[PDB]
Design a protein around this ligand. Structure first.
Ligand SMILES: Nc1ncnc2c1ncn2[C@@H]1O[C@H](COP(=O)(O)OP(=O)(O)O)[C@@H](O)[C@H]1O
Ligand SMILES: [Mg+2]
Length: 381
């Protein structure tokens, strides 16, 4: 009766599914969400993980950790680590050439390796599954980006082990998304698959060839610093200029106000994926002044148009590297929460001369969904 789970340990949002009784169930968390921010907050009395960690970042910025995936399996001296450090409000230090994050927890100075932070997220996902299933969960498939190296892969497996999971297999995110749609189980014949994965922090284009169930990654392109959080930042800039005009103050040096604004921006952005208009409502944003306004989809689309358009160059480069024409791609699959933006879908579809996109599985859940299938395969006979 033991079920294994599939876990997407994502840069910004993680997700857990289980293959049970015909179907794959993606599990809702402590606040009812099907994805969970990869955030851990250390307070005076609690260690919070996920949504409650993210929501109290405004008030406790130095002890609220995120982006651990960006440190995992790297050295402190790496140029990408030193660059990313300038943008984080939590301290990163060096221990034996390895990054650790430094925080205050229960009034005490503590340091943790990136795999320890990631194990806390994986422990939450494990317990989330246990609450739903009403039984122990001891086995998992965990996904990683196609470009992860061996030491990044081992360090992710260790995060799993530290969380009490026996890791059945570390599989690539784009391969998991293809498995989610059964693309490796369409009989004989090679197929070429393009995975367009636009997440919260990273953009990944992968060209896969599938034959007799064997996956080969033909090409990858993208940008590790393009994702939903950049669309949030465009909205943040728009609304701080609107706050200036409406209320006569610049809030660009008040970190707390900018963080509260960022939260309200991300919500508004999500609403614009299914409505043409969204309100933005924040009590006491700055010096006790409330900020209540709205924005159209069309205006959000203008604000990010260069960013959206830029996602097509990597698609083209990847196809070039794979030595394929776009008409030779059998399947295009939407992955990542940012591919729920209607304009992003229109841009990709027009690029593929009107080809229908695989998007029936919620793009932010597709990786966990394929991992769940794969975990079931590996538990089987
Ligand atoms: N309905 C939506 N419309 C637009 N963006 C969304 C929507 N839902 C989630 N997102 C965004 O998707 C990103 C999270 O992507 P996801 O794939 O879940 O995580 P990750 O990229 O860490 O794997 C965030 O920027 C989030 O705001
Ligand atoms: Mg992802």
């Amino acid at each position: 009766m033991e079920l294994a789970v599939g876990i997407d340990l994502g840069t910004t949002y993680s997700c857990v599914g289980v293959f049970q009784q015909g179907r794959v169930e993606i599990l809702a968390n402590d606040q009812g969400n099907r994805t969970t921010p990869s955030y851990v907050a250390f307070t005076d009395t609690e260690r919070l993980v996920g949504d409650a960690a993210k929501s109290q970042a405004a008030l406790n910025p130095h002890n609220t950790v995120f982006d651990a995936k960006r440190l995992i399996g790297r050295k402190f001296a790496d140029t990408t680590v030193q660059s990313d450090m300038k943008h984080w409000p939590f301290r990163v230090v060096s221990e034996g050439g390895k990054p650790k994050v430094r925080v205050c927890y229960r009034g005490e100075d503590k340091t943790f390796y990136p795999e320890e932070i990631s194990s806390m997220v994986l422990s939450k996902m494990k317990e989330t599954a246990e609450a739903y299933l009403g039984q122990p969960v001891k086995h998992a498939v965990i996904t990683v980006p196609a470009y992860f190296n061996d030491s990044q892969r081992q360090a992710t497996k260790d995060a799993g082990a530290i969380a009490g999971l026996n890791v059945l297999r570390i599989i690539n995110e784009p391969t998991a998304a293809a498995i989610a749609y059964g693309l490796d189980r369409r009989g004989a014949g090679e197929r070429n698959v393009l995975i367009f994965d636009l997440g919260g922090g990273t953009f990944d284009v992968s060209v896969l060839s599938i034959d007799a169930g064997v996956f080969e990654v033909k090409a990858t392109a993208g940008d590790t610093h393009l994702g939903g959080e950049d669309f949030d930042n465009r909205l943040v800039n728009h609304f701080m200029e609107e706050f200036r005009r409406k209320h006569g103050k610049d809030l660009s040096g008040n970190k707390r106000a900018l963080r509260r604004l960022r939260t309200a921006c991300e919500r508004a952005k999500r609403t614009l994926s299914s409505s043409t208009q969204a309100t933005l409502e924040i009590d006491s944003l700055f010096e006790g002044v409330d900020f209540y306004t709205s924005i159209t989809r069309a205006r959000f689309e203008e604000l990010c148009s260069d960013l959206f358009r830029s996602t097509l160059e990597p698609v083209e480069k990847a196809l070039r590297d794979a030595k394929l024409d776009k008409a030779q791609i059998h399947d295009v699959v939407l992955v990542g929460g940012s591919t729920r933006i209607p304009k992003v879908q229109k841009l990709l579809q027009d690029f593929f001369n009107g080809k229908e996109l695989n998007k029936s599985i919620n793009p932010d859940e597709a990786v966990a969904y394929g991992a769940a299938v794969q975990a079931a395969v590996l538990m089987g006979d």
